Amino acid sequence: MVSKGEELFTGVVPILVELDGDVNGHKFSVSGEGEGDATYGKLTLKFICTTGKLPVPWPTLVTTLVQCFARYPDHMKQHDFFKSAMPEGYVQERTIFFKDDGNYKTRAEVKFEGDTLVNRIELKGIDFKEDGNILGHKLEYNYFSDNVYITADKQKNGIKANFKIRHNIEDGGVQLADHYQQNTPIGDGPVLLPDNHYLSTQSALSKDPNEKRDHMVLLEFVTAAGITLGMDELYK
Secondary structure, three states: OOOOHHHHHHHOOOEEEEEEEEEEEEEEEEEEEEEEEEEOOEEEEEEOOOOOOOOOHHHOOOOOOOOHOOOHHHHHHHHHHHHHHOOOOOEEEEEEEEEEOOOOEEEEEEEEEEEEEOOOOOEEEEOOOOOOOOOOOEOOOEEEEEEEEEEEEHHHHEEEEEEEEEEEEEOEEEEEEEEEEEEEEOOOOOOOOOEEEEEEEEEEOOOOOOOOEEEEEEEEEEEOOOOOOOOHHHHH
């Protein structure tokens, strides 16, 4: 049957994102607006730095700035923790370790406000090098993709995840960002605790040619995978 939070995602849902950040004492805020269509795992978002110039590269914020918009295949619907927590939502926490550099620690609450899915985030970054790839703005602005590996966390009635992002550097190299993630429901209702699986995510970054503020346009696709259930046997 059609589960309860999942009903909230059958059509196009407006999204709002609000982030406050402090990285090595450089304080900033980002606001974003757009929409998600979980039927297609599709997100279209535009973010603005509302405090002026963003003091870190936009690509390093993409993962922090709504995995409830994942397309879960029909045969995997019992493994979608994210929608099962809705509308009351979940807390999403990460530590993001930038190899040979600093780290971000993030705490977000993702929940519905009326018909709008809202992601409210606090980010704290420490131990960055002033001339490293992050504070020195040496990262390319283009595209990345990777797999979010999810496991159940029965003790917190939630999930954990781990993944790597390989951010291209302007000189041809890679800046690795190792992500550790935990999500816990805000409400007390039952949630779906999943078997191990992953979200295949592709993030394409662009600019609005008419936008003079510091900003990012994001087109993202997010698809659950990694469980077969013998869907191959249907076709001999």
